[PDB]
Amino acid sequence: ANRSIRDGDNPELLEERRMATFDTDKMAAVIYGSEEFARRRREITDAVSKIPELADIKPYPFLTREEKVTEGTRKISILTKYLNQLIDRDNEEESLHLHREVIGYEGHPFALHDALFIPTLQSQASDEQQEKWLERARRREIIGCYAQTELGHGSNLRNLETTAVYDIASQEFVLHTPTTTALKWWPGALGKSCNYALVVAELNYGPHFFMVQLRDEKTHIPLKGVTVGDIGPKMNFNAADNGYLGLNNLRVPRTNLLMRHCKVEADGTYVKPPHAKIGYSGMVKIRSQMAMEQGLFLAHALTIAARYSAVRRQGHLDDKQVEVKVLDYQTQQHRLFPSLARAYAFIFTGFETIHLYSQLLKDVDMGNTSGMADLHALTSGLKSVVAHETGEGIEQARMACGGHGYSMASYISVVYGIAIGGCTYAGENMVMLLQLARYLVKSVELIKAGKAKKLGPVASYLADKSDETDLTSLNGYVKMFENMARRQAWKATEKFLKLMESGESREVAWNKSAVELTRASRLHTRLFIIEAFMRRVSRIEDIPVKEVLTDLLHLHVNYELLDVATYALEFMSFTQLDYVRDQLYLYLEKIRPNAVSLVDSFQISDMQLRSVLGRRDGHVYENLFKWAKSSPLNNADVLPSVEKYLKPMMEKAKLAAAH
Amino acid sequence: NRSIRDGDNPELLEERRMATFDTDKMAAVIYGSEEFARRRREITDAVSKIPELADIKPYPFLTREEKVTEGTRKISILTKYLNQLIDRDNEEESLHLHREVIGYEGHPFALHDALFIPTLQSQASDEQQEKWLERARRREIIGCYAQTELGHGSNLRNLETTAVYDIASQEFVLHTPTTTALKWWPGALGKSCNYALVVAELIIKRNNYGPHFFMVQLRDEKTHIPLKGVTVGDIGPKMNFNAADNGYLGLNNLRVPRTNLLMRHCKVEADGTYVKPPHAKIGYSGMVKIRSQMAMEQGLFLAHALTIAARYSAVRRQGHLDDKQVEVKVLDYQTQQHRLFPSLARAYAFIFTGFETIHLYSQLLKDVDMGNTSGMADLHALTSGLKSVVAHETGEGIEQARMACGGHGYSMASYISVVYGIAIGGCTYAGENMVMLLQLARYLVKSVELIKAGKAKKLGPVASYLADKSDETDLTSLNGYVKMFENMARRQAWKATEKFLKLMESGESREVAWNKSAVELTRASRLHTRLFIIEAFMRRVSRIEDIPVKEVLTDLLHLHVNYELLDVATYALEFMSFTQLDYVRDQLYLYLEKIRPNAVSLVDSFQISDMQLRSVLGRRDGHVYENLFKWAKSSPLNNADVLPSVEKYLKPMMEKAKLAAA
Ligand SMILES: C[C@@H]1O[C@@H](OCCCCC(=O)SCCNC(=O)CCNC(=O)[C@H](O)C(C)(C)COP(=O)(O)OP(=O)(O)OC[C@H]2O[C@@H](n3cnc4c(N)ncnc43)[C@H](O)[C@@H]2OP(=O)(O)O)[C@H](O)C[C@H]1O
Numbered sequence A: 001a002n003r004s005i006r007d008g009d010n011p012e013l014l015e016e017r018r019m020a021t022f023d024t025d026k027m028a029a030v031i032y033g034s035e036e037f038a039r040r041r042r043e044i045t046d047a048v049s050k051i052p053e054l055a056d057i058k059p060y061p062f063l064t065r066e067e068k069v070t071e072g073t074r075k076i077s078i079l080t081k082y083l084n085q086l087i088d089r090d091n092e093e094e095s096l097h098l099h100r101e102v103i104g105y106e107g108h109p110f111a112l113h114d115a116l117f118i119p120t121l122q123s124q125a126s127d128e129q130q131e132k133w134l135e136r137a138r139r140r141e142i143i144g145c146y147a148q149t150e151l152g153h154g155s156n157l158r159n160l161e162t163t164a165v166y167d168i169a170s171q172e173f174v175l176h177t178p179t180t181t182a183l184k185w186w187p188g189a190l191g192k193s194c195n196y197a198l199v200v201a202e203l204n205y206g207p208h209f210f211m212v213q214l215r216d217e218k219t220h221i222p223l224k225g226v227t228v229g230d231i232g233p234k235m236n237f238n239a240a241d242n243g244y245l246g247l248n249n250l251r252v253p254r255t256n257l258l259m260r261h262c263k264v265e266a267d268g269t270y271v272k273p274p275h276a277k278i279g280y281s282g283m284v285k286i287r288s289q290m291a292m293e294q295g296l297f298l299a300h301a302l303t304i305a306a307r308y309s310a311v312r313r314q315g316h317l318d319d320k321q322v323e324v325k326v327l328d329y330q331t332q333q334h335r336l337f338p339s340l341a342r343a344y345a346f347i348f349t350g351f352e353t354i355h356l357y358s359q360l361l362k363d364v365d366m367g368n369t370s371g372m373a374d375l376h377a378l379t380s381g382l383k384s385v386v387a388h389e390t391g392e393g394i395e396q397a398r399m400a401c402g403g404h405g406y407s408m409a410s411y412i413s414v415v416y417g418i419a420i421g422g423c424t425y426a427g428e429n430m431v432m433l434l435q436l437a438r439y440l441v442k443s444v445e446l447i448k449a450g451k452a453k454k455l456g457p458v459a460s461y462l463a464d465k466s467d468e469t470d471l472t473s474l475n476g477y478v479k480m481f482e483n484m485a486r487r488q489a490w491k492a493t494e495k496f497l498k499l500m501e502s503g504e505s506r507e508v509a510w511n512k513s514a515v516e517l518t519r520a521s522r523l524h525t526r527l528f529i530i531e532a533f534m535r536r537v538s539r540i541e542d543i544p545v546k547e548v549l550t551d552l553l554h555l556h557v558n559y560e561l562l563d564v565a566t567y568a569l570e571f572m573s574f575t576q577l578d579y580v581r582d583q584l585y586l587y588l589e590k591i592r593p594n595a596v597s598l599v600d601s602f603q604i605s606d607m608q609l610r611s612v613l614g615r616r617d618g619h620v621y622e623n624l625f626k627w628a629k630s631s632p633l634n635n636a637d638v639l640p641s642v643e644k645y646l647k648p649m650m651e652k653a654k655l656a657a658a659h
Numbered sequence B: 001n002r003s004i005r006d007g008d009n010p011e012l013l014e015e016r017r018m019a020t021f022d023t024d025k026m027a028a029v030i031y032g033s034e035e036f037a038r039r040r041r042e043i044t045d046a047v048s049k050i051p052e053l054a055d056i057k058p059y060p061f062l063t064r065e066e067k068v069t070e071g072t073r074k075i076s077i078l079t080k081y082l083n084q085l086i087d088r089d090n091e092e093e094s095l096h097l098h099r100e101v102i103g104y105e106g107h108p109f110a111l112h113d114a115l116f117i118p119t120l121q122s123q124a125s126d127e128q129q130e131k132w133l134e135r136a137r138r139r140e141i142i143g144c145y146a147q148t149e150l151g152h153g154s155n156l157r158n159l160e161t162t163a164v165y166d167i168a169s170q171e172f173v174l175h176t177p178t179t180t181a182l183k184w185w186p187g188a189l190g191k192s193c194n195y196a197l198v199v200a201e202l203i204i205k206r207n208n209y210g211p212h213f214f215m216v217q218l219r220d221e222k223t224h225i226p227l228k229g230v231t232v233g234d235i236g237p238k239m240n241f242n243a244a245d246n247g248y249l250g251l252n253n254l255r256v257p258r259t260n261l262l263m264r265h266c267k268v269e270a271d272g273t274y275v276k277p278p279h280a281k282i283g284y285s286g287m288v289k290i291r292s293q294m295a296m297e298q299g300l301f302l303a304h305a306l307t308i309a310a311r312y313s314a315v316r317r318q319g320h321l322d323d324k325q326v327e328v329k330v331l332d333y334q335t336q337q338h339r340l341f342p343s344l345a346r347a348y349a350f351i352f353t354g355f356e357t358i359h360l361y362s363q364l365l366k367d368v369d370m371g372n373t374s375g376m377a378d379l380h381a382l383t384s385g386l387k388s389v390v391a392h393e394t395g396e397g398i399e400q401a402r403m404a405c406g407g408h409g410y411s412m413a414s415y416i417s418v419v420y421g422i423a424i425g426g427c428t429y430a431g432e433n434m435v436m437l438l439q440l441a442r443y444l445v446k447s448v449e450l451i452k453a454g455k456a457k458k459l460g461p462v463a464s465y466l467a468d469k470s471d472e473t474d475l476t477s478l479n480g481y482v483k484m485f486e487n488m489a490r491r492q493a494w495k496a497t498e499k500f501l502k503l504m505e506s507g508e509s510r511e512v513a514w515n516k517s518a519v520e521l522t523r524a525s526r527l528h529t530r531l532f533i534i535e536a537f538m539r540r541v542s543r544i545e546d547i548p549v550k551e552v553l554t555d556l557l558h559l560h561v562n563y564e565l566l567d568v569a570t571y572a573l574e575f576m577s578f579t580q581l582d583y584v585r586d587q588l589y590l591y592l593e594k595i596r597p598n599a600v601s602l603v604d605s606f607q608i609s610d611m612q613l614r615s616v617l618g619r620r621d622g623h624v625y626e627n628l629f630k631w632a633k634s635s636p637l638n639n640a641d642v643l644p645s646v647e648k649y650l651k652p653m654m655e656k657a658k659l660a661a662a
């Protein structure tokens, strides 16, 4: 029962939707975590579709950079008016659906306000201070931003140049931007949108958070001591204004310092915040979240690609009278379905880490940590592998559309440009793979120390070493996938040890083995991704849904295993390698008739998809032409530039001498 | 290090003082000759004296229409200065001049030079060359290669644009019957060209002869208004290449003379007599020129990206090593050397691989001028996989180059995103990568399918290694690596062929048998071309005098063959131990550390001017932070302190929210 079937649909897609071996309302429920929310997405989408001003002013690719900032600002101010009609404002699941559909991904004045400004106020500012700002934030009375990275520093928060000196005479922090590289650089909404910022600065006590008003609340003119502006065009996310901040001995009250965990008293005593580095909690929320987000990004690209694949006919197989849908080719299925399997896998992996963090957030209001450290390390590699493999799959989804995928009419290049930033923001991907490697070394540096009973369930499989082998029913793959991770974990570990056993200093001994350590993190991460996927599948009550999700899961483990055979061949035969190589191509064929249904299940409205190639109704060619015909260069037959330059250049070129 | 200047950032100055070779010598190698390498600097110098040839403003700041305008502004000016600055019919020099002055984002004459002119050269009669080819070269007229339709790009056997000969008036009637039949994607088709080489199915009193080339005038040479029967426009914004106008073409029973059919190789006489061309597929010659060429070109884009990454990696200090005062240069980190230098090894490897296929194309272009065209099929298949693997790996490389700059890499001030957007199209144009990998796979089957027969002596030198057997395998000295790459390849080649064969002994039809083995066959193709890239590299370094250059290129080459071998270890473990895998793994890291001090020198050698580089992070002088600020401050969004859209939307929104109920 494909629920994305409508009248007037392209038969090419219709005949693909009648092939649905499951209910897509059922699958949406699984995808978005509950039957109730999956419904609410459709209700909201329907509620929005009946509000004309919430439509894109024109096709978003047709807009200039400034026209993009305007429209995102236009759309965010209108959305905010209707917001409390359409959703439960404090329901993040709904608010994300509403904004991802209505605003889009390219940015808006409130992006980082909701992404990091509010979540940090929730996890770092005293109940006193939350009363002063947190609801003013949620009421969008003010626009905030998370202002941490500097022009010279982003990855090493131990050497930020921005200063926060306390002057006990007047009980104020003087916040300064000493050097040019000390300038805040990259915070969303810092340059033009926000009038408040959470500025990270050196207190020497390390980096802390300071609420700083940047612009006057009524006039939006910057306050004395404030230099602010945009940082120019970017790879993408250009509807958002990422900016810089210059602070010239800026004075803020002592109580503009966030103090949930730490304290500075009026006389200047500093109460060290419980322990750990609790202030990095905001980053951890994002990192735990983007396994879900980059999962949905990927789903978006595949939704376009899969649908278009089922429409585009090119080349013949058998039957030399009608060309075949390109989705019938093995390479096509190969370059799409594993990534489709990944989309589901990353999202299920996302639900576990999302709940893990919102649970290990309450653990931090009790004096509990170290579930903190165990979560950080996991999401460290998780955001890295996921964003990297997502980016790979999106381009594959783009290129899979042939020539037209390169057109903005596909919109896959936008989804890539947005998503791929996840390989940089919220921690540089290499660095974050290394952070996880520090949790892996520790988990191994324990062999002669015993302490195997201290390991968490995530690291448990390390203090084992019970290889074996086999792969006749799923869990053997998982077993193989621990065996791979384990080996590389020890091997890379013992190599960093050996270079200390021969006396190269720790940090240099750490550097010489940096690549193997990252190789470990990825193997460990992809092991977890599989397990979470498995855990979600075996819970499903509806049998046809469990069935097709099993097909996806079989496809995952074999494509994944073969991508990492270089590590899997300590434990495998070469004949078994051709099994999983044959198994891969079996479930490609198995998935095929469900392909369109599997992406229809995500129930991404056309308003959110923003894709001509990926239109739900499948009327691609007719509307691709309309899209092109209405594009801005087609405003004039003979271009003003041609008349001015090319016409003279040609007249002149006819008269020139033959040398 | 010839890229050292006064006023340079000491960060980069101390990196260039570490040069263990001459960069004027390396440049000569990269560009194929000392004479040309010298010309590049000579042209760049002469260009730098002409103010009108500078970018009107930082290209990222430009709207899509302003980009078309600027490509048109700069190409009309450049055309005037063309005879001063270079030898017009020297393609090496013209490419340097345009890649630097114009750039990669497109101009009215891109495909005019890329395919329009090369197709006239290879497919038009001496008569027809007299009528147009010199007109094209003097840029009297603007042309294009109009092949791909809205519904057909890969499969040329079923294009819907017809070419019907009417013997009565001796004309071809050219028709676009359906909306999908519309030409779609030719550069300059929509707005710039007034002439187009239109590919259409040839019809002679219902006889179907396949796709052919027809010269079509589209716009009046005087008014640039389209002619009767012509529909033409732009196909909208794109992932990149947006200073160019890629267009669509609609033809309504457009009549052109019989002699607007490109003849040479083939003929249509006034009575309708069709004369078959010698080798059926002589017409795709324009495509093969591109494919042969982009190993070179997708070698240079990548170098361009690395020129920015490496330089910036030697400025950007972040994190601490041993000395816990003063942060370390990020280029010192292993992951950074690992995510950068192998691509640097590929950039060199691709370019040298490019020199070989460029030269034998333009010589197996003379083989097509009277006689044997056996090295036509052998070249097509080589360049089929070569463009696919190269463009794909150049893609991964260039993204790695961007992310290497961290946060700032995402900014347009790095320009690596542009370079990525431009080159990655190479995975699509000039043949869809999967389709092209499958094309070489057919040449691999047929090459294998010649050895259970006894025609191994029909094999070319490229395919030769397939009839052999290496069995015994080691390294210790390079040639053993090539021997290892001869395996895997040969291994998979047979392994994939016999699977496709078995499916036919299963009685599954060829097309379906081919389809079910399609992935294995592409694995075979990739392995084959990676072997070639390595050999090509080898043949270039073991040939040149100047030992410092031959030694740094040997360092690169060692890094290549070790990094590549590990990337394909899964195939290399039919022939290797495991302990040797740790050697090649150890060997990889040794040459990362060995290359490191030459890093800035190896890229400075490409002698890409700032004018061409168009990157703030990649500035030659190395003044990044100072100029990154200046750049941002000048960016268009900062024209006002309070945005018009903030005053109009955000201010009233905020007022309302404060007053609104709880
Ligand atoms: C529009 C929107 O767009 C998008 O929005 C998202 C945009 C996100 C906005 C941003 O980009 S802002 C921030 C992102 N930037 C970063 O992340 C880089 C920060 N990275 C670092 O700072 C370092 O790498 C660390 C992680 C090493 C932190 O360490 P240090 O401070 O520099 O110094 P040290 O004192 O040396 O720390 C190392 C030891 O401390 C332990 N440790 C570290 N972190 C934690 C932690 N979190 N919890 C517990 N323990 C920890 C650790 O054990 C280390 O010791 P041991 O490893 O030797 O054993 C979304 O799509 C969403 C969408 O809505």
Ligand SMILES: C[C@@H]1O[C@@H](OCCCCC(=O)SCCNC(=O)CCNC(=O)[C@H](O)C(C)(C)COP(=O)(O)OP(=O)(O)OC[C@H]2O[C@@H](n3cnc4c(N)ncnc43)[C@H](O)[C@@H]2OP(=O)(O)O)[C@H](O)C[C@H]1O
Pocket (backbone or CB within 6 Å): B110, B111, B114, B115, B145, B147, B148, B153, B154, B155, B156, B157, B281, B284, B287, B288, B290, B294, B297, B376, B377, B380, B428, B429, B430, B431, B432, B435, B439, B442, B443, B446
């Ligand atoms: C700005 C600028 O940007 C950039 O500019 C570049 C832009 C480039 C402009 C374009 O994108 S336009 C054209 C690009 N499009 C393509 O390429 C797709 C064409 N692909 C095809 O058409 C098919 O895939 C082929 C290759 C299979 C051709 O075959 P069919 O016609 O469709 O039908 P059949 O009759 O079935 O052919 C198969 C049998 O024929 C044999 N054969 C095929 N090709 C050749 C050949 N070339 N030579 C010799 N033999 C050949 C072959 O043996 C087959 O038989 P066996 O395999 O079974 O044994 C640069 O950066 C440069 C920069 O300057």
Ligand SMILES: Cc1cc2nc3c(=O)[nH]c(=O)nc-3n(C[C@H](O)[C@H](O)[C@H](O)COP(=O)(O)OP(=O)(O)OC[C@H]3O[C@@H](n4cnc5c(N)ncnc54)[C@H](O)[C@@H]3O)c2cc1C
Pocket (backbone or CB within 6 Å): A112, A146, A147, A148, A149, A153, A154, A155, A156, A185, A186, A187, A188, A237, A242, A421, A424, A425, A426, A427, A428, A430, A431, A434, B316, B318, B319, B320, B330, B333, B335, B336, B403, B404, B405, B406, B407, B408, B410
């Ligand atoms: C779209 C986008 C949006 C952003 N939004 C915000 C925002 O709203 N608020 C905010 O505060 N910031 C924001 N940022 C900044 C971002 O958080 C930081 O840039 C990122 O966390 C780290 O980038 P970096 O400049 O520090 O890279 P770098 O730390 O300089 O690293 C660059 C290179 O050096 C390597 N490297 C650096 N250190 C090490 C090390 N110890 N070990 C091994 N390798 C190392 C890295 O692997 C990498 O290859 C944004 C960035 C982007 C791209």
Ligand SMILES: Cc1cc2nc3c(=O)[nH]c(=O)nc-3n(C[C@H](O)[C@H](O)[C@H](O)COP(=O)(O)OP(=O)(O)OC[C@H]3O[C@@H](n4cnc5c(N)ncnc54)[C@H](O)[C@@H]3O)c2cc1C
Pocket (backbone or CB within 6 Å): A312, A314, A315, A316, A326, A329, A330, A331, A332, A399, A400, A401, A402, A403, A404, A406, B111, B145, B146, B147, B148, B151, B152, B153, B154, B155, B184, B185, B186, B187, B241, B246, B425, B428, B429, B430, B431, B432, B433, B434, B435, B438
């Ligand atoms: C920047 C750019 C510039 C261009 N410039 C020009 C120009 O100047 N002149 C011109 O004529 N054209 C031009 N083109 C068009 C280009 O030549 C075609 O887009 C390209 O050849 C790919 O063809 P396609 O669009 O039909 O891909 P498709 O065939 O539609 O690809 C769709 C999917 O199906 C797969 N597929 C298709 N056939 C098979 C098969 N037999 N077996 C297995 N898989 C298959 C493909 O691999 C792909 O994954 C340009 C394109 C781009 C992106």
Ligand SMILES: Nc1ncnc2c1ncn2[C@@H]1O[C@H](COP(=O)(O)OP(=O)(O)OP(=O)(O)O)[C@@H](O)[C@H]1O
Pocket (backbone or CB within 6 Å): A334, A335, A336, A396, B388, B389, B390, B392, B427, B433, B434, B437, B519, B523, B526, B567, B568
């Ligand atoms: N030349 C290429 N151009 C574009 N995409 C490619 C290319 N080669 C591989 N891919 C893509 O990479 C993904 C991985 O597929 P595959 O494993 O066959 O390639 P690979 O891993 O690079 O090859 P191998 O596994 O033999 O090393 C596929 O989705 C495929 O579409």
Ligand SMILES: Nc1ncnc2c1ncn2[C@@H]1O[C@H](COP(=O)(O)OP(=O)(O)OP(=O)(O)O)[C@@H](O)[C@H]1O
Pocket (backbone or CB within 6 Å): A384, A385, A388, A423, A429, A430, A433, A515, A519, A522, A564, A566, B338, B339, B340, B400, B566, B567
């Ligand atoms: N999560 C990631 N984010 C960014 N880049 C990555 C990531 N994982 C791998 N890479 C890049 O891939 C390239 C080579 O991959 P790697 O060093 O892992 O070797 P590999 O053996 O081919 O991969 P694997 O270790 O997964 O088998 C490097 O340039 C590295 O930067």
Ligand SMILES: [Mg+2]
Pocket (backbone or CB within 6 Å): none
């Ligand atoms: Mg890797």
Ligand SMILES: [Mg+2]
Pocket (backbone or CB within 6 Å): A562, A563
């Ligand atoms: Mg693979």
